[PDB]
């Protein structure tokens, strides 16, 4: 505890994120809606807008 600011311990957590190559198993709090076909619509498929 007598050390300086550069010699003090730091706890590090590194979150490495995979791409959408595999099934998107970790997905955030977004509520999915019903699918509408044959119409000019905006779409958000697993973060692909």
């Amino acid at each position: 505890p007598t050390y300086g600011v550069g010699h003090q311990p730091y706890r590090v957590v590194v979150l490495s994120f995979e791409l959408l190559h595999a099934p998107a198993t970790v997905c955030g709090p977004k509520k999915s809606t019903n699918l509408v076909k044959n119409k000019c619509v905006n779409f958000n498929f697993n973060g692909l807008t």
């Binding site: 050390y3 300086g4 600011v5 550069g6 010699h7």
Partner: protein
């Protein structure tokens, strides 16, 4: 700061990795070079202002 020290370092092998042990500073602030790449290239003169 109005009478800042200036020491010329020359004719020696410079190892910049011991500065972290010498001083409790958090990080460098290097402008023309990179602090990780300082152990490779050789300099003509180096001046330590303080």
């Amino acid at each position: 700061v109005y009478a800042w020290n200036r020491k010329r370092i020359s004719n020696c092998v410079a190892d910049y990795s011991v500065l972290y042990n010498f001083a409790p500073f958090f990080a460098f602030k290097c402008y023309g070079v990179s602090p990780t790449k300082l152990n490779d290239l050789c300099f003509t003169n180096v001046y330590a202002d303080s």
